[PDB]
């Protein structure tokens, strides 16, 4: 499913509102990308399905902390 493994962002339902204020249901999808992160603690490439915001979170925190959170949450990566 379209879920960011770092942040948990899912598709979220909302409205397309016309100029006549016609409300038709729609989905906002996240900006998911499958990325191979070079983990140094294991000398490996770990593939994760991550949003761009999650990638910024990885850049800030460090991949080690993010993976620690993921494995504390479960999330077989």
């Amino acid at each position: 499913s379209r879920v960011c493994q770092v942040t948990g962002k899912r598709p979220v339902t909302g409205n397309n509102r016309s100029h006549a204020l016609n409300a038709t249901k729609r989905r906002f999808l996240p900006n998911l990308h499958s990325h191979r992160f070079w983990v140094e603690s294991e000398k490996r490439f770990v593939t994760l399905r991550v949003s761009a915001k999650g990638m910024r979170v990885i850049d800030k925190k460090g991949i080690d902390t993010v993976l620690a959170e993921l494995r504390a949450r479960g999330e077989k990566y």
Binding site: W38, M55, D59, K60, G62
Partner: protein, 149 residues
Amino acid sequence: MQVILLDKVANLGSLGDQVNVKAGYARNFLVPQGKAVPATKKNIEFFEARRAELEAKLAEVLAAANARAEKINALETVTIASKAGDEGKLFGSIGTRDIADAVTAAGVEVAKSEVRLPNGVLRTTGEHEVSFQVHSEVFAKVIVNVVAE
């Protein structure tokens, strides 16, 4: 993205400098190789102690060919050789990269890689370059004094 350079980079800095590098460059090239590492405060507070080992030992043993992408083309190396080949068009032959070399035996020692394996190509109508290669057809086809010298 602010990063501290563990080694020399072409147009960013040399041997320790908080450089504002684009996130894609840092994420995909500098950190996957041994060139830089992001400065999250604690990292520089460890770098200020690591510099004793880094700036001398690692600097002496390896300070060029950080990713063998541009330093191989700029700093010409492994020019001297003995193996010629077939007629002047290297194709699938690793040749010699370590033996019969003098400059690449002291401190900093750049390196090279292999070429395209034989599946469609052969000893005519093209050539290869003795250096690191990702492309094998559109890559530069400059003579390296190994294809026929």
